[PDB]
Amino acid sequence: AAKDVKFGNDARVKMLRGVNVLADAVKVTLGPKGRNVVLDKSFGAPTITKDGVSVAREIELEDKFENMGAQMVKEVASKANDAAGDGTTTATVLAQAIITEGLKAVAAGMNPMDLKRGIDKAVTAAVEELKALSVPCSDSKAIAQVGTISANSDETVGKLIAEAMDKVGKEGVITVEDGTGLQDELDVVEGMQFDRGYLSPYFINKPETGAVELESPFILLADKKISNIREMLPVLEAVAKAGKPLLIIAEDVEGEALATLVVNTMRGIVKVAAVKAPGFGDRRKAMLQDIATLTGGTVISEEIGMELEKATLEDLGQAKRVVINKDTTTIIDGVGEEAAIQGRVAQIRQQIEEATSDYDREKLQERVAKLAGGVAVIKVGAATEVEMKEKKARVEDALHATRAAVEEGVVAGGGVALIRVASKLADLRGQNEDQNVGIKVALRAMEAPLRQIVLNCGEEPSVVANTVKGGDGNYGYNAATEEYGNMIDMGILDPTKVTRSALQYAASVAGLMITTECMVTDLP
Amino acid sequence: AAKDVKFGNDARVKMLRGVNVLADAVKVTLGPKGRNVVLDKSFGAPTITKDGVSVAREIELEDKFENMGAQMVKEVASKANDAAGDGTTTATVLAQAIITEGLKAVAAGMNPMDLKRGIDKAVTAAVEELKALSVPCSDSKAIAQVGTISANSDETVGKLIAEAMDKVGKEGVITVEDGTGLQDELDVVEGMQFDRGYLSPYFINKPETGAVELESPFILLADKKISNIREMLPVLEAVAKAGKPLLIIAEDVEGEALATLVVNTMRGIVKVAAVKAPGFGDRRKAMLQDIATLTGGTVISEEIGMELEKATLEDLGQAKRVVINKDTTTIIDGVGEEAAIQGRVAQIRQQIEEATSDYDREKLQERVAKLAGGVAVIKVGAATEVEMKEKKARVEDALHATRAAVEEGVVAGGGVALIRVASKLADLRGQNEDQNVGIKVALRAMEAPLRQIVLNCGEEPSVVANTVKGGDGNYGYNAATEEYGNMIDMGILDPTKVTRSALQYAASVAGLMITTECMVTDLP
Amino acid sequence: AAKDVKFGNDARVKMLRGVNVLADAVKVTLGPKGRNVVLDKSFGAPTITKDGVSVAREIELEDKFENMGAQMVKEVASKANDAAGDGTTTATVLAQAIITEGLKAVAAGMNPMDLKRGIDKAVTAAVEELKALSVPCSDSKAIAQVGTISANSDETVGKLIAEAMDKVGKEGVITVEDGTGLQDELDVVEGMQFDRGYLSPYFINKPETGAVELESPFILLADKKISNIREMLPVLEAVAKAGKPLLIIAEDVEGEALATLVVNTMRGIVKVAAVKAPGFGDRRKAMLQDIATLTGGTVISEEIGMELEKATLEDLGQAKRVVINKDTTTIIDGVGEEAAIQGRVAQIRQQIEEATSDYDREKLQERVAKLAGGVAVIKVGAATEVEMKEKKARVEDALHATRAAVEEGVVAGGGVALIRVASKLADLRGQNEDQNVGIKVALRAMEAPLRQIVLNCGEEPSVVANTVKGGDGNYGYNAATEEYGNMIDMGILDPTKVTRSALQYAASVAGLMITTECMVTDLP
Ligand SMILES: Nc1ncnc2c1ncn2[C@@H]1O[C@H](COP(=O)(O)OP(=O)(O)OP(=O)(O)O)[C@@H](O)[C@H]1O
Ligand SMILES: Nc1ncnc2c1ncn2[C@@H]1O[C@H](COP(=O)(O)OP(=O)(O)OP(=O)(O)O)[C@@H](O)[C@H]1O
Ligand SMILES: Nc1ncnc2c1ncn2[C@@H]1O[C@H](COP(=O)(O)OP(=O)(O)OP(=O)(O)O)[C@@H](O)[C@H]1O
Numbered sequence A, B, C: 001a002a003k004d005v006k007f008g009n010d011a012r013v014k015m016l017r018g019v020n021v022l023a024d025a026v027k028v029t030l031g032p033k034g035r036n037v038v039l040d041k042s043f044g045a046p047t048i049t050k051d052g053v054s055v056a057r058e059i060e061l062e063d064k065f066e067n068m069g070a071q072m073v074k075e076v077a078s079k080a081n082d083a084a085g086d087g088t089t090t091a092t093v094l095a096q097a098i099i100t101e102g103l104k105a106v107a108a109g110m111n112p113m114d115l116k117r118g119i120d121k122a123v124t125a126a127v128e129e130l131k132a133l134s135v136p137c138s139d140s141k142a143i144a145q146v147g148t149i150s151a152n153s154d155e156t157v158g159k160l161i162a163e164a165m166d167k168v169g170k171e172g173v174i175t176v177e178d179g180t181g182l183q184d185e186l187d188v189v190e191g192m193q194f195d196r197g198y199l200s201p202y203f204i205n206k207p208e209t210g211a212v213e214l215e216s217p218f219i220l221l222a223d224k225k226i227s228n229i230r231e232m233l234p235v236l237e238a239v240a241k242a243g244k245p246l247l248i249i250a251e252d253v254e255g256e257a258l259a260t261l262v263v264n265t266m267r268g269i270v271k272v273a274a275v276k277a278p279g280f281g282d283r284r285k286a287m288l289q290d291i292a293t294l295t296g297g298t299v300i301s302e303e304i305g306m307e308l309e310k311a312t313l314e315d316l317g318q319a320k321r322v323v324i325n326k327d328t329t330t331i332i333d334g335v336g337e338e339a340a341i342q343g344r345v346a347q348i349r350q351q352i353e354e355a356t357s358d359y360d361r362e363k364l365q366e367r368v369a370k371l372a373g374g375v376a377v378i379k380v381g382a383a384t385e386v387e388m389k390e391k392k393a394r395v396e397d398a399l400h401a402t403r404a405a406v407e408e409g410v411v412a413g414g415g416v417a418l419i420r421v422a423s424k425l426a427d428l429r430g431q432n433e434d435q436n437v438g439i440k441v442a443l444r445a446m447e448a449p450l451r452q453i454v455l456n457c458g459e460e461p462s463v464v465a466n467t468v469k470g471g472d473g474n475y476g477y478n479a480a481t482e483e484y485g486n487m488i489d490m491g492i493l494d495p496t497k498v499t500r501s502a503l504q505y506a507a508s509v510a511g512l513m514i515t516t517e518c519m520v521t522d523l524p
């Protein structure tokens, strides 16, 4: 359609107006004194959130050029959320500061390309300095502090996340879901607990618990789906001769085979329980093989070549305990080779490295957590759905921040790491004066998060920033107590990954934004 | 529908207004000091680009006659992008200059047809002079300089493209795709690496790598799809007698045949791996034949006449190494006749010459790069998607410019080649004074790119153009450093093909545009 | 009424837009190649003029802030017209250039007050350098060149003005009026020619000429008005005894006195002619006293004390010749003391110095021109009234420029004097960097007149300015011939007063304009 074209100061001014609208909606959420933003939803009640990414996602302006700027600067928060899951508001603040200072420089007549190059050089040096300044975060105390800070100072959330990570270990998985109660609950399950229940309610050995409990049972892992008892009769006869119980993991057991297994279950010749194999095509086989590796068994398939009529007790797997319920199947202490379990885990790790999809890699990591480590569910407790959504967002931010901290370490919070980095980079220079000015605007924007935190607390951002800069190391300003001190000692920690990601994405977007001279959009 | 008709100076003025709108949106991107244009997208975030073709494609005006002019002059950028992949902004600037001067001449009362004829004669002479002035660009240093200049002075992009061309050779292929990391990555694969993985995960000889590795295996190339082991049993028996591994390239191996091959793979009688043939109908056969030529084998087909029961070891191909993964199959050092490989490559070259489709010719060239030469992928590294798009556009422009340079050579950049060409053509004359004036306006427009570069740098275009014209040879003006010198020595090079294509397309469109006396469009 | 208030870049941008509208309407008139502007008049036909002051006076914009800027920058042209009567377009161009560069500096973040101070310092130094570079313009050839240049190269106007000044001398007066013919006419009258005709038509001594001609007559200067012959009878009797004619200069002669004088005129006893005294109250007495000083007589008044009955021949003045017509009275070679005439002229000069009104000082200068020197009228010849107005404006500009040249000298035209002044002031510095930048913008704007002249001629302003700056002394660019040479030799001269006044007024207005941060106006 017909296009409105704007040039020079007019287009840049409208772009900055939109960026400022979005960043002003977002930055009110920054800091422990940060406020909440209510986002109207066309469906359901409004969402009250302290997430800059959510606020930015909702922002959209009538003016096409202002909306253009808002959309461009919203990529910063979106990318920060995608990568680190935290620091979206900080990244938006950094992008707004960089855009403002760079547009000042552009109106000053400096080359926008050189300003962008200087910003990029300053940000690269700042990332290197952040890596140097970062310290490993392996202690549960530091992890709890990081989670508490990322959850808007919810010590309960921080300590719960620390406990969950301690329980599940390095290779473990943690997920966040809704809770029925008012309190946050942690549910940790070890080993395999794939979500497949008994195929027949009459397999229940223990009625008062409504669950099948097998002690030292064999495990028969069948890739095919079975409807007749003939193909398995040798296996059931061998199991009955052995005397121990049996668990079948199959695509489907139904009809004559299922009925015969059930009848034998009452008759007591064999304590047999059957369940569906977990997952679906091209993943069911993988999970069956992981169970085989855990239990020291082999998967019976037609592709592999073996037949069920020829299956033997040695072919069958072994585990110490098994608990089936209507919902989930759990195998406890599968009798399998530890070297083999680690080899399979390494293969799944290689698959995760090869993977390029978030869903694929998280499913692979869930498989790793089932094989080794454990799986934890944090049920967020809230009285209402709006509170549930807000607390779930905060808990997810805390979990993401803790993962970032373990992955890349921690730095002083409250915008102190960026302040120190800029102080170290004061001597940095570019190829020309425009690049030097770009470096300087990047360094000055590095102070934007702390200044915005102070502003939201209501104090004087310039005074606080000057005091922090005069300080050294981890010395900083506590927004909660409105005092100064060592941020590490006070427990105000930010993941180095979060800070670096915010800086990087904000710098890229803001540099390209300031390099703009024309804006083309649809007419009103 | 009812039509608005405009005549003479009014129609030409509206046409020029639209052309000027488009060219003003586009030309701000010209030069190292050129700025970026933000294009609103109805879907997704706005696109920040320095590409005149993209800007022109987005341009569209409310006024029907202005939009008419914009659309006509947009063909210049579109055709330049299609042919050379670079110089779109230069072509648009040239078209705008030619249109402006020619419309001045038309208002001056000269014959527009004679002006167009003079412009065409001047452009033909200018193309001949560009060919004379061009120098071959075979050195990796010149290639890197060309890529760096076309990538808005990204030495990293230039050197990466130079390395990729050095690795893949003349007949090699290079493509540009998105990258997950922040840095630009180069991935070069030699020989055949068609994207077909193992048909059965259990073929993996090396589990820690999750890949099949065959040393000196035979290759059985089957055009048909196979589901039974009977037709192949003689071949498998011969292979087992030989003792070396075997790779099957077929339309599909499934069911009994696949299962038997897999079972034999564990049993160790024959180290057999099977994969799908690459491509689809009417291309699968061609790629199978190229693999046969590479490996010194023969393709088994029903059309050709041979049967698989009668296939022999001599019929089977031979290669030194083979590596299969879930994603791709790679054959290393196929034992085939070099004369035959060159003959097949020449046949594919003849097919490329006969081809009239970009997709067909690029697929044929990919086949050539698989047979001989190699295939390179440049994964563009960017922190955000907008930066990724901008950097990918710049890298594609650099790759296109480097290909143009190798194809047709290089000339002095910064609008210096056109300046020198016009100086050489100062004595050119037409059949009449109107043709002479058309020649003169074409020559004056030849200076438009340099003047626009200077204007974007903020200096005085007339002074810079006068100094460059007073200079001789490759003497020019460095927009980046705002100094004068030998453009070749400074590394400011433009492909002769890019310059010639921009000039030619701009001249054709602009001449026809100035020859206009009436414009017919839909009413508002 | 309610007010719209605008701040910062928005207000300055609107101010600059209005200034640019006015300056663009005005600057098309600059140069020998300068064009004419047609100004619609609510009454009468439109006025075609090449006067920047007239164009600016007519300019008025719909937007209140743009109109604000236009009105402020119109003061420059108005003040230049009031002071020098020429250089209005040059002053407007200088103001526009200063405003543009200073607003660039302001957007650059420099202090507007310091920019204004630097501009003022640069302009003071430039005025001093203009005074140093100026050369006296006392030769009629230089005067004619100046007039020709100021009349848009009308050699006829220049030579006519040179002849008029040569005739009337230094203390003479020149005025411009409409002419009935197609050719410009010069009418010079020496001595006293006050516009008072014979009180009675029958005084005509020469009927074929319809005028009174008296040879060596006495002059009776009466401050009172007379209606009876008794008070004068002794004087008439003495005159009749003497035998020479008599001229009465009185407030009014009527009734019995006039009738008796007329009757005696026929009877021939006394050749008496009577006329009204010139001017009105508080000026009639002064002009009567100047006539008395010229003719060596005394004014008869009641305030002074003498009575007409006691007046004598010695009291009566003496002159060599007298010519009265219905329109004007002229006295030729009044017999008065030269020392006295110079003393009265010096007294009138002191009165001119004390005077603070243009009308008062021009009337005093007319009295000086009547006493000594002469009075010249240039009747502008034109075929139509529009041509008459245009040519009269050009002739008035030429006269003002010639007066400025005699008063303060001449400098090289075509914007060369300002170029040389800026070159000399290149080393000038202020108290701070903002003042230095203000100096630099003033120096760059000093080049604006030459660049605008070149632009109106259609050539390259930057190239022409560079060539002129590379030149030295009076070397410049001839807009008429589009060649370079010594402007003095080519006859392209501009009054130093005109150039200095344009620079000063433009600098003052532009500095104050750039020092603006808020604009308050009425709402739309
Ligand atoms: N008590 C505190 N004193 C000082 N700074 C604090 C304190 N608590 C938190 N902060 C800082 O507040 C900053 C912003 O945290 P917040 O969770 O509000 O937003 P964010 O990290 O920018 O992003 P998101 O909106 O995605 O959660 C963090 O950098 C943290 O360092
Ligand atoms: N440092 C430099 N000095 C002088 N000229 C330069 C310099 N760098 C690039 N140029 C010139 O800039 C001109 C424009 O390059 P640019 O990549 O901006 O646009 P283009 O080639 O017209 O088209 P496209 O928009 O499709 O990339 C090229 O002709 C190149 O010669
Ligand atoms: N032949 C010429 N070559 C170069 N410059 C010339 C020539 N003739 C005139 N000029 C310059 O043209 C400039 C502008 O003259 P012009 O009479 O058009 O306007 P002005 O002096 O700015 O003001 P005004 O509009 O009040 O007359 C003068 O400075 C004069 O020096």
Ligand SMILES: [K+]
Binding pocket: A029, A030, A031, A034, A050, A051, A052, A089
């Ligand atoms: K927040």
Ligand SMILES: [K+]
Binding pocket: B029, B030, B031, B034, B050, B051, B052, B089
């Ligand atoms: K471009």
Ligand SMILES: [K+]
Binding pocket: C029, C030, C031, C034, C050, C051, C052, C089
């Ligand atoms: K003028």
Ligand SMILES: [Mg+2]
Binding pocket: A086, A087, A088, A150, A151, A397
């Ligand atoms: Mg947070």
Ligand SMILES: [Mg+2]
Binding pocket: B086, B087, B088, B150, B151, B397
């Ligand atoms: Mg390019």
Ligand SMILES: [Mg+2]
Binding pocket: C086, C087, C088, C150, C151, C397
């Ligand atoms: Mg003039």
